[PDB]
């Protein structure tokens, strides 16, 4: 009868959003990307409503709450994407926009999609359960901080440590330490994935010659975050050195 922190993560997991992709017009890499950015914006809005419900999170200082979302949105998007695809060889951006074998072969398409496929295959390889996914995703929200530290650093530290233990518990309720090592090792490798995805994301955003549109929700985050990779004020928290 006592609710666990994991049962609560289950409840607050947002609905899966449709892409609104017109299935009667020829595909192109411009059209897909632009649609996905738009989707990305709505997914970010969802993630905020989600974070606010994670126990502890709303108790941080508001600037810290903001920082963490600005730092981790791509981790949260990429990882959820991995999960959706894993649960389907393909990429499930939405129930109305699945990148099949056909769409994969489009110009510049697989070039990026290989990075999002990696996440999806790691989850399959390690055969991750839902409750692990939910703990891992929560840790991803807590995976980068300003090098200078957060304002509520003390509390953040407690929150992170709780969800590490929580991940640990999920493993037990599923070779246990080995699996703990493997899943944290995966979380670590999300940094590399996200760096790649953000590089092309920022590069496109800044390019004038590409007519790729971004929704304002994303454009504000991207604008705010450009300098912090240029001044290197981000500390990536790792489980293994």
């Amino acid at each position: 009868l006592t609710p666990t922190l994991v049962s609560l993560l289950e409840v607050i997991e947002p609905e899966v959003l449709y892409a609104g992709y017109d299935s009667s017009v020829p595909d192109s890499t411009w059209r897909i990307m632009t649609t996905l950015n738009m989707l990305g914006g709505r997914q970010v809005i969802a993630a905020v409503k989600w974070a606010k419900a994670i126990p502890g999170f709303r108790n941080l200082h508001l600037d810290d709450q903001m920082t963490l979302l600005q730092y981790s949105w791509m981790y949260l998007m990429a990882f959820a994407l991995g999960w959706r695809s894993y649960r389907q060889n393909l990429l499930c951006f939405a129930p109305d926009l699945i990148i099949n074998e056909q769409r994969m072969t489009l110009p510049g398409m697989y070039d990026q999609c290989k990075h999002m496929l990696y996440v999806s295959s790691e989850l399959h390889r390690l055969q991750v359960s839902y409750e692990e996914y939910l703990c891992m995703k929560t840790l991803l929200l807590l995976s980068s901080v300003p090098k200078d530290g957060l304002k509520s650093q003390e509390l953040f530290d407690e929150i992170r440590m709780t969800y590490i233990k929580e991940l640990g518990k999920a493993i037990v309720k599923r070779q246990n330490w080995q699996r703990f090592y493997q899943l944290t090792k995966l979380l670590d490798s999300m940094h590399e994935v996200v760096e790649n995805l953000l590089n092309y994301c920022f590069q496109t955003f800044l390019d004038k010659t590409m007519s790729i549109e971004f929704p304002e929700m994303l454009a504000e985050i991207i604008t705010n975050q450009i300098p912090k990779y240029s001044n290197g004020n981000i500390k990536k928290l790792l489980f293994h050195q």
């Binding site: 508001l62 903001m66 600005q70 985050i221």
Partner: peptide
């Protein structure tokens, strides 16, 4: 980014 501050309040 004001929109984010909002959705968080």
């Amino acid at each position: 980014n004001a929109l984010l501050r909002y959705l968080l309040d």
